Amino acid sequence: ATFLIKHKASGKFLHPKGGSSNPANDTNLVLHSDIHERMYFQFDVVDERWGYIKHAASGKIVHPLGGKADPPNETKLVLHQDRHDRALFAMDFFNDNIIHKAGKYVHPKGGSTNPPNETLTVMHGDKHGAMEFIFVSPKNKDKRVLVYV
Amino acid sequence: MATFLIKHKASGKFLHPKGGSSNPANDTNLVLHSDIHERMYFQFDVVDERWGYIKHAASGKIVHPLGGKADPPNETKLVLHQDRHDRALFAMDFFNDNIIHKAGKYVHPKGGSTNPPNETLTVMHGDKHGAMEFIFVSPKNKDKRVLVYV
Ligand SMILES: CC(=O)N[C@@H]1[C@@H](O)[C@@H](O)[C@@H](CO)O[C@@H]1O
Ligand SMILES: CC(=O)N[C@@H]1[C@@H](O)[C@@H](O)[C@@H](CO)O[C@@H]1O
Numbered sequence: 001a002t003f004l005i006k007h008k009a010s011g012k013f014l015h016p017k018g019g020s021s022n023p024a025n026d027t028n029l030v031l032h033s034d035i036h037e038r039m040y041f042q043f044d045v046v047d048e049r050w051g052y053i054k055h056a057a058s059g060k061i062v063h064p065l066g067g068k069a070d071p072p073n074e075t076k077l078v079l080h081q082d083r084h085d086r087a088l089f090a091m092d093f094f095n096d097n098i099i100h101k102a103g104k105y106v107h108p109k110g111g112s113t114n115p116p117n118e119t120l121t122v123m124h125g126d127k128h129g130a131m132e133f134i135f136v137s138p139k140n141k142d143k144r145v146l147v148y149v
Numbered sequence: 150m151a152t153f154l155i156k157h158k159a160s161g162k163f164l165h166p167k168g169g170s171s172n173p174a175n176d177t178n179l180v181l182h183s184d185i186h187e188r189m190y191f192q193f194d195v196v197d198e199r200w201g202y203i204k205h206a207a208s209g210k211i212v213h214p215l216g217g218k219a220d221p222p223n224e225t226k227l228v229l230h231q232d233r234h235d236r237a238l239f240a241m242d243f244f245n246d247n248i249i250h251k252a253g254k255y256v257h258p259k260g261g262s263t264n265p266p267n268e269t270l271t272v273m274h275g276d277k278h279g280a281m282e283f284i285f286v287s288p289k290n291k292d293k294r295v296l297v298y299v
């Protein structure tokens with residue numbers, strides 16, 4: 001499956017900063033309003049719920065910056081080519097969030113309900129409406145799609 | 150496609166057709182029972198994103214509210230039936246650990262016990278609590294969660 005990662009409260013989407021089809025390692029993941037093929041994602045299942053969030057255009061995957069196992073609050077999210085267990089996430093399409101292996105969630109930095117374009121994404125333990133995400137068709141940004149297949 | 154056991158989280162019992170047949174009759178009740186064997190394996194056939202059919206692997210019959218109504222009341226029994234239609238849609242919530250019908254009620258053991266005895270019937274009920282939690286596990290390791298959506 002190929003999908004968009006849509007911030008529920010704002011309707012903005014996860015992008016590599018700059019929108020490249022081949023972002024460098026450690027490129028930040030931001031929120032931005034635009035839809036294009038360089039903000040499509042895939043999900044590579046590794047173990048049941050756990051897997052890699054894959055930037056479709058480049059094949060790089062989402063990491064906490066630095067690849068720490070138990071990233072603290074405010075750790076930036078980036079793309080990197082490496083595959084390892086510290087880049088495992090789950091796509092909770094029931095509670096509408098993205099959870100890292102060590103139990104924190106993807107947030108817009110600052111936790112706004114309407115983050116501006118280019119807002120950084122970070123890890124944070126809190127749960128609230130401004131950390132919800134839904135996973136939608138590139139063809140219809142309101143149509144949820146199953147990311148596990 | 151993924152084959153799995155439907156395990157009542159609190160008790161460790163599993164969903165079975167009552168009687169354990171490879172070919173249960175239509176409207177056979179779904180019960181909880183401790184045994185593990187190929188006649189209590191399930192599969193999930195995705196229809197629309199989260200929604201799909203919970204399929205008894207041996208027979209090909211799927212889980213329905215008895216009588217097949219769109220918005221079944223509390224205490225509606227769960228059964229197997231061959232028919233495929235939109236009143237037999239469920240989602241396998243492997244994050245909250247529950248089985249939810251399209252109209253919003255959950256699979257429960259009748260009475261809501263943490264340790265239901267073997268042969269306890271399953272029903273639909275809107276309440277949420279620990280005794281309506283289910284996990285979806287490997288036939289080869291009843292403690293290993295498996296992805297049912299594949
Ligand atoms: C014109 C152009 O490529 N625009 C993109 C935009 O669509 C978005 O992807 C953004 C993310 O930081 O990077 C660029 O500015
Ligand atoms: C050597 C080493 O630890 N490499 C990791 C790399 O694997 C990736 O996780 C990256 C994410 O920012 O952080 C580090 O550079």
Ligand SMILES: CC(=O)N[C@@H]1[C@@H](O)[C@@H](O)[C@@H](CO)O[C@@H]1O
Pocket residue numbers: 074107108109110111112122124126128130131
């Ligand atoms: C009080 C408040 O809004 N807190 C939020 C917190 O919940 C989390 O979303 C964080 C992400 O950077 O941004 C804020 O600090």
Ligand SMILES: CC(=O)N[C@@H]1[C@@H](O)[C@@H](O)[C@@H](CO)O[C@@H]1O
Pocket residue numbers: 165166167168169170180182184185186188189268
């Ligand atoms: C020997 C045998 O298949 N026994 C089964 C048991 O395993 C269980 O499936 C039960 C469910 O009502 O039906 C039978 O008693």
Ligand SMILES: CC(=O)N[C@@H]1[C@@H](O)[C@@H](O)[C@@H](CO)O[C@@H]1O
Pocket residue numbers: 176213214215216217218228230232234236
């Ligand atoms: C004619 C009619 O409603 N048939 C339904 C059938 O499709 C199935 O849903 C069954 C489940 O117990 O309930 C009824 O018999």
Ligand SMILES: CC(=O)N[C@@H]1[C@@H](O)[C@@H](O)[C@@H](CO)O[C@@H]1O
Pocket residue numbers: 224257258259260261262272274276278281
């Ligand atoms: C126990 C209790 O107060 N309520 C439960 C309810 O939550 C549900 O589990 C139902 C299923 O038949 O069994 C009881 O009525």
